[PDB]
Amino acid sequence: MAESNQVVQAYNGDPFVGHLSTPISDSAFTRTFIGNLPAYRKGLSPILRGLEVGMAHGYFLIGPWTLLGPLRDSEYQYIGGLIGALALILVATAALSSYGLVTFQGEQGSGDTLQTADGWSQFAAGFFVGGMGGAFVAYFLLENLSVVDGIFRGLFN
């Protein structure tokens, strides 16, 4: 009740922190949704976080080159997409690992097991395995798109 029908408030109750509590920044839905993504989900080991993020990213990264790459109008369309996505995930893993190497040179913190050298390295390992796996399974599903189509239509029974 009262007089505050207002939907925007000071972020975390401190009006002098440069941020605002808004329906996009700090609603219950965004808190629960962002807070349960692999990056923030409570209790997860960084290996599983990396694995999940890599699965999602490797899976979806096959598409752009698959439909729009230079081999899209060749007999090696899906292989071209796969090669592109694999090389991209390799470069991304190198970027993640270089980041971990440079930002965790000093004393290791304690609150965030992902924000350590060991944790960020585990995240990179999981991300590599998940990205390569997701890219290869997206490629495998696309390369056998006819059997997936017949499966979804019942063309085999």
Binding site: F152, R153, G154, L155
Partner: protein, 40 residues
């Protein structure tokens, strides 16, 4: 299984989405919710 109606590629992916993904996700959310032991 086919369809001559408009945009007949929609059941193709919506039937798996309604039968597999929607129930899996909603049951998983409700499962983690009813088991949540946060005080209150």
């Amino acid at each position: 299984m086919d369809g001559s109606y408009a945009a007949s590629y929609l059941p193709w992916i919506l039937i798996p989405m309604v039968g597999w993904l929607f129930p899996a996700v909603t049951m998983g959310l409700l499962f983690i919710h009813i088991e949540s032991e946060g005080e209150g």
